Every structure is written in structure tokens, then in C-alpha cells.
Scaffold this active site. Structure first.
Site, PDB file in Angstrom:
ATOM      1  N   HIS A   1      -4.455   3.219  -3.349  1.00 52.42           N
ATOM      2  CA  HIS A   1      -4.600   2.702  -1.997  1.00 52.42           C
ATOM      3  C   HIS A   1      -3.793   1.434  -1.738  1.00 52.42           C
ATOM      4  O   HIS A   1      -2.992   1.373  -0.802  1.00 52.42           O
ATOM      5  CB  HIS A   1      -6.056   2.379  -1.698  1.00 52.42           C
ATOM      6  CG  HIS A   1      -6.227   1.430  -0.555  1.00 52.42           C
ATOM      7  ND1 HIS A   1      -6.134   1.826   0.760  1.00 52.42           N
ATOM      8  CD2 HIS A   1      -6.405   0.087  -0.531  1.00 52.42           C
ATOM      9  CE1 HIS A   1      -6.245   0.769   1.547  1.00 52.42           C
ATOM     10  NE2 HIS A   1      -6.410  -0.298   0.788  1.00 52.42           N
TER      11      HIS A   1
ATOM     12  N   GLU B   1     -17.576  -5.364  24.611  1.00 55.61           N
ATOM     13  CA  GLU B   1     -16.686  -6.519  24.608  1.00 55.61           C
ATOM     14  C   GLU B   1     -15.492  -6.403  23.662  1.00 55.61           C
ATOM     15  O   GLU B   1     -14.351  -6.685  24.042  1.00 55.61           O
ATOM     16  CB  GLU B   1     -17.475  -7.795  24.273  1.00 55.61           C
ATOM     17  CG  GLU B   1     -18.573  -8.125  25.277  1.00 55.61           C
ATOM     18  CD  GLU B   1     -19.886  -7.404  25.004  1.00 55.61           C
ATOM     19  OE1 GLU B   1     -19.977  -6.698  23.984  1.00 55.61           O
ATOM     20  OE2 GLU B   1     -20.835  -7.559  25.807  1.00 55.61           O
TER      21      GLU B   1
ATOM     22  N   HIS C   1       0.802  -1.210   0.000  1.00 55.54           N
ATOM     23  CA  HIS C   1       0.000   0.000   0.000  1.00 55.54           C
ATOM     24  C   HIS C   1       0.833   1.256   0.000  1.00 55.54           C
ATOM     25  O   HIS C   1       1.358   1.655   1.032  1.00 55.54           O
ATOM     26  CB  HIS C   1      -0.907  -0.024   1.228  1.00 55.54           C
ATOM     27  CG  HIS C   1      -1.764  -1.244   1.299  1.00 55.54           C
ATOM     28  ND1 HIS C   1      -1.250  -2.499   1.559  1.00 55.54           N
ATOM     29  CD2 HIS C   1      -3.088  -1.418   1.067  1.00 55.54           C
ATOM     30  CE1 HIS C   1      -2.222  -3.394   1.478  1.00 55.54           C
ATOM     31  NE2 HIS C   1      -3.347  -2.764   1.181  1.00 55.54           N
TER      32      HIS C   1
ATOM     33  N   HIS D   1     -28.142 -16.899  24.614  1.00 57.13           N
ATOM     34  CA  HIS D   1     -27.079 -16.768  25.600  1.00 57.13           C
ATOM     35  C   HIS D   1     -26.260 -18.034  25.822  1.00 57.13           C
ATOM     36  O   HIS D   1     -25.184 -17.978  26.417  1.00 57.13           O
ATOM     37  CB  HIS D   1     -27.675 -16.310  26.942  1.00 57.13           C
ATOM     38  CG  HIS D   1     -28.057 -14.863  26.966  1.00 57.13           C
ATOM     39  ND1 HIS D   1     -28.909 -14.305  26.040  1.00 57.13           N
ATOM     40  CD2 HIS D   1     -27.672 -13.850  27.779  1.00 57.13           C
ATOM     41  CE1 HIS D   1     -29.031 -13.010  26.278  1.00 57.13           C
ATOM     42  NE2 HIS D   1     -28.292 -12.708  27.327  1.00 57.13           N
TER      43      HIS D   1
HETATM   44  C1  LIG Z   1     -11.772  -5.331  10.104  1.00 53.34           C
HETATM   45  C2  LIG Z   1     -11.263  -5.147   8.687  1.00 53.34           C
HETATM   46  N1  LIG Z   1     -12.196  -5.084   7.697  1.00 53.34           N
HETATM   47  C3  LIG Z   1     -11.820  -4.920   6.403  1.00 53.34           C
HETATM   48  C4  LIG Z   1     -10.459  -4.816   6.059  1.00 53.34           C
HETATM   49  C5  LIG Z   1      -9.970  -4.627   4.642  1.00 53.34           C
HETATM   50  N2  LIG Z   1      -9.400  -3.290   4.416  1.00 53.34           N
HETATM   51  C6  LIG Z   1      -8.036  -3.031   4.550  1.00 53.34           C
HETATM   52  S1  LIG Z   1      -7.699  -1.341   4.213  1.00 53.34           S
HETATM   53  C7  LIG Z   1      -9.395  -1.040   3.902  1.00 53.34           C
HETATM   54  C8  LIG Z   1      -9.702   0.387   3.504  1.00 53.34           C
HETATM   55  C9  LIG Z   1      -9.824   1.389   4.640  1.00 53.34           C
HETATM   56  O1  LIG Z   1      -9.421   2.631   4.063  1.00 53.34           O
HETATM   57  P1  LIG Z   1      -8.759   3.715   4.925  1.00 53.34           P
HETATM   58  O2  LIG Z   1      -8.623   3.275   6.370  1.00 53.34           O
HETATM   59  O3  LIG Z   1      -9.618   4.923   4.836  1.00 53.34           O
HETATM   60  O4  LIG Z   1      -7.345   4.010   4.412  1.00 53.34           O
HETATM   61  P2  LIG Z   1      -6.736   4.503   3.046  1.00 53.34           P
HETATM   62  O5  LIG Z   1      -7.376   3.844   1.881  1.00 53.34           O
HETATM   63  O6  LIG Z   1      -7.022   5.989   3.031  1.00 53.34           O
HETATM   64  O7  LIG Z   1      -5.258   4.171   3.205  1.00 53.34           O
HETATM   65  C10 LIG Z   1     -10.221  -2.112   4.035  1.00 53.34           C
HETATM   66  C11 LIG Z   1     -11.757  -2.150   3.833  1.00 53.34           C
HETATM   67  C12 LIG Z   1      -9.555  -4.894   7.160  1.00 53.34           C
HETATM   68  N3  LIG Z   1      -8.206  -4.805   6.963  1.00 53.34           N
HETATM   69  N4  LIG Z   1      -9.942  -5.057   8.464  1.00 53.34           N
HETATM   70  C1  LIG Z   2     -23.556  -8.370  23.594  1.00 51.89           C
HETATM   71  C2  LIG Z   2     -24.122  -8.555  24.991  1.00 51.89           C
HETATM   72  N1  LIG Z   2     -23.274  -8.330  26.017  1.00 51.89           N
HETATM   73  C3  LIG Z   2     -23.680  -8.475  27.293  1.00 51.89           C
HETATM   74  C4  LIG Z   2     -24.998  -8.866  27.595  1.00 51.89           C
HETATM   75  C5  LIG Z   2     -25.503  -9.043  29.010  1.00 51.89           C
HETATM   76  N2  LIG Z   2     -26.496  -8.028  29.384  1.00 51.89           N
HETATM   77  C6  LIG Z   2     -27.874  -8.221  29.227  1.00 51.89           C
HETATM   78  S1  LIG Z   2     -28.774  -6.795  29.778  1.00 51.89           S
HETATM   79  C7  LIG Z   2     -27.253  -6.007  30.197  1.00 51.89           C
HETATM   80  C8  LIG Z   2     -27.424  -4.638  30.781  1.00 51.89           C
HETATM   81  C9  LIG Z   2     -27.739  -3.567  29.762  1.00 51.89           C
HETATM   82  O1  LIG Z   2     -28.546  -2.604  30.464  1.00 51.89           O
HETATM   83  P1  LIG Z   2     -29.569  -1.768  29.708  1.00 51.89           P
HETATM   84  O2  LIG Z   2     -29.544  -2.140  28.229  1.00 51.89           O
HETATM   85  O3  LIG Z   2     -29.215  -0.344  29.849  1.00 51.89           O
HETATM   86  O4  LIG Z   2     -30.979  -2.054  30.258  1.00 51.89           O
HETATM   87  P2  LIG Z   2     -31.702  -1.904  31.654  1.00 51.89           P
HETATM   88  O5  LIG Z   2     -30.906  -2.375  32.799  1.00 51.89           O
HETATM   89  O6  LIG Z   2     -31.953  -0.416  31.740  1.00 51.89           O
HETATM   90  O7  LIG Z   2     -32.952  -2.715  31.450  1.00 51.89           O
HETATM   91  C10 LIG Z   2     -26.110  -6.722  29.957  1.00 51.89           C
HETATM   92  C11 LIG Z   2     -24.635  -6.295  30.218  1.00 51.89           C
HETATM   93  C12 LIG Z   2     -25.839  -9.083  26.434  1.00 51.89           C
HETATM   94  N3  LIG Z   2     -27.159  -9.474  26.559  1.00 51.89           N
HETATM   95  N4  LIG Z   2     -25.407  -8.928  25.153  1.00 51.89           N
END
Ligand SMILES: Cc1ncc(C[n+]2csc(CCOP(=O)(O)OP(=O)(O)O)c2C)c(N)n1
Ligand SMILES: Cc1ncc(C[n+]2csc(CCOP(=O)(O)OP(=O)(O)O)c2C)c(N)n1
Ligand SMILES: [Mg+2]
Ligand SMILES: [Mg+2]
Lengths: 666, 666
Positions: free
Chosen positions: B266, B414, B29, B477
Site C-alpha cells: 500500500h 457541513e 504508494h 452552540h
Molecule cells: C481523512 C484521512 N484519514 C486518514 C488518512 C490516512 N490514510 C491514507 S491512505 C489510508 C488507507 C485507505 O486505503 P484505501 O483508500 O482503501 O486505499 P488502498 O490502500 O487500497 O490504496 C489511510 C487510513 C488520510 N489520508 N486522510
Molecule cells: C452539526 C449541526 N449542524 C447544524 C445544527 C443546527 N440545527 C439544529 S436542529 C436543525 C434541524 C434538524 O432537523 P431535525 O433533526 O430533522 O429535527 P426536527 O425539526 O424534526 O425537530 C439544525 C440544522 C446543529 N445543531 N448541529
């Protein structure tokens, strides 16, 4: 519209159905339903257009509970509205084995629930897909004198969804696409499981949404400001060019004298003592799972009114069908799920004389062939259209001004992309969405993919650069454990076509499976068309491409997939010269093979033949179920390397010589 | 500081090293390096503090290239700065087998590269972890008369990283934490792989960042505004309570007369003709991989200056070790990675008389016992502290005002959490970061976990609610395919302890493996302490816990993990009544067992014994390698259900009777 004491009673009926359902199961989440009952009532009783006796009515408004743990809110509303899926006894079976009221909303268990939520953030992303579908359909089929598609997408989300990156990915796309009919309600209650949100979430959500292109509104009194909520929704539908975020400040567990506004009420039964205290506080004399007659009477109008809304729409469609017969015929396909006769004939066919090509390029040929015969095919790549080879050449890009186009550009948002496609797939049975990225990046979107499998959404995942064959980009880009990680996931097909015929076969299978997602692992490098491959073989999962043995007892059985099939074939020729009888088996899909009869399996992998070899550029884990105990699996059980593909194959032993060396060990 | 023609030549040297390297490999690149050369030059030549001859100096400023594809930018800078890891010949081996210059930056391959990037968004999240680490360390060890830890974290990201949800998660956290020393450069070039960003990315990035709590600056001329860049950095260091985002507008492929500002530049080599045209356009007579002598001379000062900077800090640390001997000793452990003698004795020990408990609670006891003897232990849960049981009781929470605390609250993010831990793990070898969530949500953060394995970051993943045993929350879950999905991933331990002794053993293993991440699958439900379990056994991966056979030839071998070991133990007792000799094996970890000697393996799974049974509440895929062709694997190869755990175990046949029924099939 209900008012005064009737309104209060209806709102409390919802809270107490939730409280009693949870208390009985001694499991569940009473907090959200208690604080969100007011907006739930306004939404299902006054705003949304639906027919409780027909949860499949095409033009119905869609509701999505993104904060799935609060499902009792939705079950209460479906029950009151008159849906046949949630009767009194179902409420009493909350979170119990095999009920229509599981711990988290599941579309496949409960008619009336549009998608499966629970994993936070998926819901709001699905709603973006649902709203995209409606806008696309409206732009594509609506006429000046006939607006047949017209519905809103409502979604309730909490703090958890707002913190998840998938939500920001989807909302960024929603703002970019001008999804005016997407209206999100954010339950601003300042509580998550760890307690007060000030502990880890102090960003200005509203300002972030504005930056994303959303229209924003704030209802400060979510507990009793019924008119504020009504007014907010009204203003939201007025803004037609931007999705609207309505922040509704409520107190979790509202009505509970001692547990309101605390993390204790988020996810556990209130308890006998607090239930009694809550009933006295709200003035709820009524007992367990009771719906006051006047409240029941008020809600019963939704049945006749629902039937009339649909009758009205039907009349409109009939008139549309007679003026625009062709457009109507096409729209009907998307609405009913019935695919056009002879779509299978549009798929390309190849012979070993056809020039070789990467399966990613052959995939593009199949996609463009299908786009002509399947009206619901729609999708795209996450910023990799020129590598994934996913553009439908005869269409432009879906955008706010060209929503009728069928190429969707997701940007670098894999996870959001997956959930949006789940939304499209579950909008109408005739949609056949497909999305793409490098196979290795399924990791970023694995959450939405698992939901595809569990919710029975027929999304087609086009994954290219499936192995070390991609070369120089290196280990961060080379899949290794990916194929088996998906063969282990229930209800999802892991197809890895070897050539043009298998690729077309993979697509036939993918389109035919509208209740089970399909993943296609496609190569970056050119592969030869092999003799013996066929569309029909693919449907079998594992099938024979060449065999010089008799009596179903070859000396050796060699199996491979994708780009390594060619290697298995070359090695087999070599071994046949030495006078051995060899059977070459293609395992495009383990899933389809396991589904075949015992007779079929025996005919491909005879139990008597013990000399078996498998070859695949990926983890060897799991291949033992086919190569047996005395068999040999050739693969890669370590990370890749940054170098030209050819060099990696040689260094890792993914060669014809390794197959031969292994053959002479029997 | 360079100026005039010397500055122009230095900046162009960077552009051309990148161009020539890509042209020679005919892969890579060139765009990002060409557009970002100016800010890279200012950063490495004028701003950062480091010793090129000692890439490990503790107090060095840290740089991270989040837009990993543009690695030539960093290789060119490391080369010019004098790092021994990138000589002229390494530049000529770009993207070639076994070189120190792989296609994407890998910390394990190149001293001077801090973390592994390439998958977009990971880098900016890692930088958040690196900055958190410095803030924590300063707050914890700095004295009013001795500021021993003080360094900045610089990161360069592109549009791709800005679109990824993981970036928003980490930057939301960085603003909340007031990481004033984190300074991010956003290469605002309006280009991504699909072409112009207007196609899918039109959000107001700067406003989103302000909403997240970031200080924002915009440099409009990133191609030649050297003084605007310098000024921006100066202001960024002045704002001490908020991370700073510096949007630097540049043109990708700057300098190329025909490929600048297009997607064509790119990710592919410019090509002979365009390279010549580009050399003419910039006025670069010099040939392939050439570093003008005056530029070389200017850059060489970093070696003696670097040596002097480190010497200064060493004196400062020596005076610190004299006054605050205790604090110094503790800090050295984090710096050198040398753990305090006897930390192992701090782990809890149990017997079958100890009361039964869920392994998630036993996990907490181990974490708290360890906090006392391992100074670098730090971490937390993603809004699930009360369920994952991750709080270190003797400490408070890490926040902008209490950065010396050791409990980190990640909120519901996460993926960002995983990447942040990789940053902490890779800040210093003595850090032992741990993070947590429900096992099923590893899917959300799988991208970062894979990087932990590849980059050899010893992160400890505490994953609770590992099976259908969690009960009522349901299939969304409940993990099923997760255990095998990780047993297939290279360089990661998949531990599933059965009781207290095994949990303590799992932590001993996790702490000892600082170069390989560990995942701990912990239960929701209470499990008994079993006779036969031990810390030592866990180090072996697969070991016997009970055996009544002689001559290493039992009639039956029953193996299990975690919560199912108890079932296998109960079934063995029944079978032993009928006079059969049964060996019960615990498979806490497949990985550790496979690493054992052939003699050891034979001593646990004698090749002569064919009657084998395995039981685990997860996918059966892969168990064939241990149960043999004639063995039976009892597991779950479908999604779960919403119901009390007990009912699910019965309905799915994960019972003692199933083991017995299968035992009588031999
Ligand atoms: C999680 C993830 N998804 C997709 C890709 C593939 N990918 C590598 S570079 C790129 C383009 C992102 O462009 P940018 O960050 O704006 O940089 P530039 O082209 O300006 O160098 C993509 C889609 C990747 N490397 N990682
Ligand atoms: C991706 C993901 N991560 C973690 C959880 C566990 N989880 C279920 S409800 C919750 C709390 C989120 O609270 P909120 O959405 O604000 O609702 P409230 O307590 O107000 O009902 C979590 C951490 C999940 N269901 N999905
Ligand atoms: Mg909340
Ligand atoms: Mg860019």
C-alpha cells in the site's frame, strides 16, 4: 401499562410540559417533543429499566436524545419518572442562567442525562459507543450461570442526524459489530429547518441502513399507533444479532391546529394564541405546568419498581462476587472508577543512555504497560494501527464474535471514532478509552473532540506525526495550526512530550484526568532521551530541564516542546560555552503550567528575565504570553512542503542556528 | 484504441513509472497505481476529452483522484498524455523539495491536477461540486441550437474514501441532484492500511449507493477486463439522470509476485529485490523510468487530437458569442475570472443614522446586491437559510430540474458542503461560491476549510451566531476558541465586521481574494451602525474609528471586533469625559493588518503607547501581539452557558465597566 384515557392524558402531559416550558422561556423547541411524546411515553414508562432515585445504577438501560434540540421531551420524562434532577421549579427555569435544564441536554448539568448532545449526529454515534461498552463488558464478564451485565441502548434521532456523515460512520460500525442491543428510533417527520425535507434529502434511509447491516422496521402511525410502537420494540429486542432502526413517522408539532407539520413549530414558542388553540384542540383544560393527579399517580410506581430492579441486580452481583471473585474485582474497577493501587508503577522510565526512539513508539510501550494494570483501557486507531503504534500486543480485535477483546479497529472514520469513545467514557467511570489517527486529522473529528472537553469525558487522543517531521507526505498531512487550535479550546490538555520520560509522564496525567480529555502529539521520527526530563515535571506543564544560572536570573531562557526540545538543548550547550547562563524550559503543556501557583511560575519564568526564546514546529501565535514582548518565537506560520523532514527543518529555519542568531539579538 | 501487446505494454508502462518513482524516492504508494493502471489507461487514453497542451480549456472533462496517495497513477498519465507539467525529470523528483510531483496531488503545484487531495473523502465531494458546476452552467447557458458546455466529471476513490462520512454526505446530495455526468470509479481491492477490509468494513457499498439515488455497476475483473471497463463506461454515459458508481474489483500491487494483495504494498517502496522479481513476473526488460517507443508513439496522438478538440469548441463558442452576445459576455466572466466593471459600487453604504441590524442580516443585503453584478456568485446554507440569512431573493433553488438556479440547499451536511464548494471554486476562476452554517459548526467541516486555504480556493464562508450573543442554545452552540483557531491557520481571512459598513467591506475583500478563502463571523443580535467605520478601513484589517488624541500619542488605545466594538466605543466616550485621550481601533481582520506596512502599523498602534485594551467575545489567546506585555485583554477563556445573551455578557464581564476598570489600572 397505561391505556385508554389515562394513556392519552400521560402523552399529552408530556406535550404540554414541553409547550409551557418553551412558552415561559420564549425560547426552545416545541415541535419534536409534541410529535415524539408517544414514543417517549412508551420508552420511559413501559420499556426502559432504570431506578429514578439512582441515575448511576450500572446495569440501567441507556437513553440518548440525539436530536438534542428536543430536550424538553427528555426533561418532561425525567420529571415524571421521579428523578431528583428535574423538579417542577427546574422546568420553570428552562434555558435560564445556571439551571439544570439548559437549551440542549448536558450530562454534566443534569443527572439522568447520559451524554451531551445538540451538535447533530453526536448522539447516535455516542449510543454506538454505549452499546459497544455493554457488549464488551457482557462478553468479558458474563458467565454461563451469571449474566450480570445486560442492558439496552435506546436512541432517538431526527432528519438532521441522518444527514450527518458522523452518523453514517457510526452506524456502519454498529452494523459491522452486530450491536443487537442498540435500538434507534428515527423521527420521520419530513421537516428540518429549511422546511420540507424533499428540498435536500430524498435518499432511502431504510435501505441505506440495511446496507449497513441494520435490522429495519417502519411504524407508519407514530402519532397514535401506540401498539404499533410497542410491537416494533418487541420485535427489535427479538433480533439479537443486528442493531435495529425503527422509523417512526410522526407529524412535528402534533396537536397544534395551525402550526403542526410546518417549520414554524420546529424551534420557537407557539405563542399565546396558538397555545390556547392547542389546549382546546387536545382538550387540555389544565393550566400552566400541570400534571394531572392520576397521571402523577401512575408514574409514581417507577420509584418502588426502580428500587426493586436494582435490588434484584445487586443480589445477582453479590452472588457473582462470591463465585468469581477475581472477575468481580476487575469489573468493580470499571464500575466505580477506582483505579488499581500502584498502576503508576507500571509506567516505563528512561535515562539518556536508553536508545532514542520516536515518541509514537514510546507511547506504545506505555499503552501496553498500562493495559495490564488498568482494566478499563480500551481503544484503537482509525486504520493507522501500524503508524500510530496503538495495538495492545496481548489482545486480539473487538468484533461481533470476540467482543471481549480490547483492540478496536475503527476504519477510516475519525469523527465517528471520537464520538464512540465519548460514549465509552461516559458509560462507566472506570473506562479509559483512547483513539488515534494522524494529528492533522483531528480536523475531521474536531466536533466530537470539543464535546469531550465540554462534557468532561476523559478520552485520551493519541495523535502521531505531529509536524513537518513526517516529511514527504506533504502539506496536506503536516499540522501547523493544530497545537494552538487546541491550546485555545477550554478543558482539554494539549501534551507534546519530548522523550520517553515525558511520554510516560503525559500518560500519567492523561489517566489521572478522568474529567478532562487529553491529546498527545507524538512524533513519527526518532528523538533522543534528554537529561532533565521526568514524569514529575510533566505534571507541572512547564518545567526546567537544565540550568547553569544562579539567583533565578539566567541571561537567557530557551523554551521548547516535543521534537524541538532537543534543538533548544543543543543550542543552550553552545551558548554556555560562550559563557552565558541559560535555562532550558520544557513546555509539555501550557494548560498544566497555567494551573500552577504564581510562585512556581516565577521560579520557571522569572519576570526579571526578558531575553526569552521559544522554538516549536508549528504556529507562533500565542507564544507571546511566555516569551514576552521583547522575546522571540521561532516557528512555522505557513503551510508545509513535500520533502524529506531534514530538508524542511533547514528550509524553515527550525534549527539550532536560528536560536543562536536570535540569542545574539539581546 | 490500443489493443493486444500494445495495450499490455501501455498498462505496464504506467505500473512501472509508479514503481520506479516510488523506489527512487524510497517513499510513496505503489499499490493503487499498480492495481488501477488498467482503468487509468482506458480513462486518459480512450475516454476523457482534453488538450494536454492547455490544462485550462474550459470544456475539458475533469478527472479527480480522491485516493490521493496513489498520485503516481495520475503523474504517470499526465506524463504519457503530454502535459508540460510532468516531464521525465519531474517523475525523478517525486516527493523531493520543490518538485512539481509532491507526495499528494496539489492543483497549485501541477497544471493538470484539478484539486488538492490526500485527506480522504475530499476528492469525491469535490467531484460532486465540479459536476454541479457543469450542470448549472449547461442549464444556464446552453441553447437549443448551441450546446457550449458539456463535460463529464470522473473520479477514482478507494475504501478509505468510502468509509469517510464526508463521502456519504456528498454522494447523498449528488443522487438527490441527479448528476448524470458524474462517474465514479471505486477501486474495490479489499485492502486498507490495517489490512483486509473485513476487519472494519463489511457494509454493502453498492446497495448504500442505490439507496442514495446512484446507478450502480460492478466490473469483477479490474486487473485484465479492459472490455468490461469500457462497456461499463458506455452504460454509465447512457444513464443520464443519475450519477454512476462503477465498482472495479482489483488487486492492490497487481504484478508484484510477493507483495500483491497485501497491506505491505500500500504505502512503501517495493524494494530492490521485489522490483526485480516484479519486472521478471510482468516481463518488463526495460530499465528505470523507461517509456517504450511504441507506447510513446501511441500516446503522442493526444497532442494534435487535443489541439483539434479545443479548436472545435472554440469555433462553437465563437458562433455562440455571435448569436447570444449577452449570455456569452456573462459566461466569459465565469470562465476568465474577470469580474464586471463597477461591481464594487453595488455594495450597500450606511451611516450611524441607519437603523441598527444584526450583521447576519446586513450580510444578506450584500449577498443580494452582489448577485446582480457577479455572475459566478452561487451558494447557500446547510439547512439554516432562515437563520444564516443566505437566500438570494431573486432566484429559486438548484435542483435536478432547475439546475440554472443559484440558491443551493445543502441539508445538514457541513463537511460535504465545504468540499463541494472547493469543487465549484476550482471549476472555473469566475465562480465565487459561498456556504453557511453557525460559526460553531465549522468544526464539522474544518477538514475542507483547511483545504480551501491550502489549495487557494476563494470560497466565502458565511458563519453566523458567532458568540455567546446567540444566547439560550448554550455552550454546545457558542464559539469560544474558533476565531483564534482560524487566525492561526495559514492563508485564510478571519473577518469579524462590527456593522453594515464593515460587513460590506468584508464582502469587498472576500470577492477580491479569489486565491484565498474568507470566513465572515456574523452576529445573531442587532448591532448599531458606528461612526468611523468604512469599506476602506476593512481593507486595512486594523484601523482607527475614533480618536481625540494629538501627535499619535493617546493615553489609551481600545481595540475590539464585531459585536464588541460597540462596547469599546461606549467605554471610550466615558473615559474621554474624564479628560483622557482615547483611540478606538477596529480589528476586523488580523491577517489584513499584519500585511500592512510598518509605517501604517505604527500609525495605528504607536510603539510608544503602552496602555492597551482589547475586548472580544472569544478566547484571549494571541491578543498579546497587539495589546503588548503591559496591555489587558478582555475575553472568554471557558465554555459558555444556556441563558439570555444579556445575562451571559454581564456574568462574563464583557462590559463597558470592565474596560473602564482595566483602564484605571494604568
Ligand atoms: C481523512 C484521512 N484519514 C486518514 C488518512 C490516512 N490514510 C491514507 S491512505 C489510508 C488507507 C485507505 O486505503 P484505501 O483508500 O482503501 O486505499 P488502498 O490502500 O487500497 O490504496 C489511510 C487510513 C488520510 N489520508 N486522510
Ligand atoms: C452539526 C449541526 N449542524 C447544524 C445544527 C443546527 N440545527 C439544529 S436542529 C436543525 C434541524 C434538524 O432537523 P431535525 O433533526 O430533522 O429535527 P426536527 O425539526 O424534526 O425537530 C439544525 C440544522 C446543529 N445543531 N448541529
Ligand atoms: Mg425532522
Ligand atoms: Mg483499498
Amino acid at each position: 401499562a397505561a391505556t385508554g384515557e389515562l394513556l392519552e392524558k400521560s402523552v399529552n402531559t408530556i406535550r404540554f410540559l414541553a409547550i409551557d416550558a418553551v412558552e415561559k422561556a420564549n425560547s426552545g423547541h416545541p415541535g419534536l417533543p409534541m410529535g415524539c411524546a408517544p414514543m417517549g411515553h412508551v420508552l420511559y414508562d413501559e420499556v426502559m429499566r432504570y431506578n429514578p432515585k439512582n441515575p448511576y445504577w450500572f446495569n440501567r438501560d441507556r437513553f440518548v436524545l440525539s436530536a438534542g434540540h428536543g430536550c424538553m421531551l427528555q426533561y418532561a420524562l425525567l420529571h415524571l419518572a421521579g428523578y431528583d434532577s428535574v423538579k417542577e421549579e427546574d422546568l420553570k427555569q428552562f434555558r435560564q442562567w445556571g439551571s439544570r435544564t439548559p437549551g440542549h441536554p448536558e450530562n454534566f448539568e443534569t443527572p439522568g442525562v447520559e451524554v451531551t448532545t445538540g451538535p447533530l449526529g453526536q448522539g447516535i454515534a455516542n449510543a454506538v459507543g454505549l452499546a459497544l461498552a455493554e457488549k464488551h463488558l457482557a462478553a468479558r464478564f458474563n458467565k454461563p450461570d451469571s449474566e450480570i451485565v445486560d442492558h439496552y441502548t435506546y436512541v432517538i434521532l431526527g432528519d438532521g442526524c441522518q444527514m450527518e456523515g458522523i452518523a453514517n460512520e457510526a452506524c456502519s460500525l454498529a452494523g459491522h459489530w452486530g450491536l443487537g442491543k442498540l435500538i434507534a428510533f428515527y423521527d420521520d417527520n419530513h421537516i428540518s429547518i429549511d422546511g420540507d425535507t424533499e428540498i435536500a434529502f430524498t435518499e432511502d434511509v431504510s435501505t441505506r441502513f440495511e446496507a449497513l447491516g441494520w435490522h429495519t422496521i417502519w411504524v407508519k402511525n407514530g402519532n397514535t399507533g401506540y401498539d404499533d410502537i410497542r410491537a416494533a420494540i418487541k420485535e427489535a429486542k427479538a433480533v439479537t444479532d443486528k442493531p435495529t432502526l425503527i422509523k417512526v413517522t410522526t407529524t412535528i408539532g402534533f396537536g397544534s391546529p395551525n402550526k403542526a407539520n410546518s417549520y414554524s413549530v420546529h424551534g420557537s414558542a407557539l405563542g399565546a394564541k396558538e397555545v390556547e388553540a392547542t389546549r382546546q384542540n387536545l382538550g387540555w383544560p389544565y393550566d400552566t405546568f400541570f400534571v394531572p393527579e392520576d397521571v402523577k399517580s401512575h408514574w409514581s410506581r417507577h420509584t418502588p419498581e426502580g428500587a426493586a430492579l436494582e435490588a434484584d441486580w445487586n443480589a445477582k452481583f453479590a452472588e457473582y462476587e462470591k463465585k468469581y471473585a477475581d472477575d468481580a474485582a476487575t469489573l468493580k474497577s470499571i464500575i466505580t472508577g477506582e483505579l488499581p493501587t500502584g498502576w503508576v508503577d507500571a509506567l516505563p522510565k528512561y535515562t539518556p543512555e536508553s536508545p532514542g526512539d520516536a515518541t509514537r513508539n514510546l507511547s506504545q510501550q506505555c499503552l501496553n504497560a498500562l493495559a495490564n494494570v488498568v482494566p478499563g483501557l480500551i481503544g484503537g486507531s482509525a486504520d493507522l494501527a501500524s503508524s500510530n503504534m496503538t495495538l495492545l500486543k496481548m489482545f486480539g480485535d473487538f468484533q461481533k464474535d470476540t467482543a471481549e477483546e480490547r483492540n478496536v479497529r475503527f476504519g477510516v472514520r475519525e469523527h465517528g471514532m471520537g464520538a464512540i469513545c465519548n460514549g465509552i467514557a461516559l458509560h462507566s467511570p472506570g473506562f479509559v478509552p483512547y483513539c488515534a489517527t494522524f494529528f492533522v486529522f483531528t480536523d475531521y473529528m474536531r466536533g466530537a473532540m470539543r464535546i469531550s472537553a465540554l462534557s468532561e469525558a476523559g478520552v485520551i487522543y493519541v495523535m502521531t506525526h505531529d509536524s513537518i517531521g513526517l516529511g514527504e507526505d506533504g502539506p496536506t498531512h503536516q499540522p501547523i495550526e493544530h497545537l494552538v487550535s487546541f491550546r485555545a479550546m477550554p478543558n482539554i490538555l494539549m501534551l507534546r512530550p519530548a522523550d520517553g520520560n515525558e511520554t510516560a509522564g503525559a500518560y500519567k496525567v492523561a489517566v489521572l484526568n478522568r474529567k478532562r480529555p487529553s491529546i498527545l502529539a507524538l512524533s513519527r521520527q526518532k528523538l533522543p532521551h534528554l537529561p532533565g526530563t521526568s514524569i514529575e515535571g510533566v505534571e507541572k506543564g512547564g518545567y526546567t530541564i537544565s540550568d547553569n544560572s544562579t539567583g533565578n536570573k539566567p541571561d537567557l531562557i530557551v523554551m521548547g516542546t516535543g521534537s524541538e526540545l532537543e534543538i533548544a538543548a543543543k543550542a543552550a550547550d553552545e551558548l554556555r560555552k560562550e559563557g552565558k547562563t541559560v535555562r532550558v524550559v520544557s513546555f509539555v503543556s501550557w494548560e498544566l503550567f497555567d494551573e500552577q501557583s504564581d510562585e512556581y511560575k516565577e521560579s520557571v519564568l522569572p519576570a526579571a528575565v526578558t531575553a526569552r526564546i521559544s522554538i516549536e514546529a508549528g504556529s507562533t501565535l500565542g507564544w507571546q504570553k511566555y516569551v514576552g514582548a521583547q522575546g522571540k518565537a521561532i516557528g512555522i506560520d505557513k503551510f508545509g512542503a513535500s520533502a524529506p523532514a531534514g530538508t524542511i527543518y533547514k528550509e524553515y529555519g527550525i534549527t539550532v542556528e536560528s536560536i543562536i542568531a536570535a540569542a545574539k539579538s539581546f
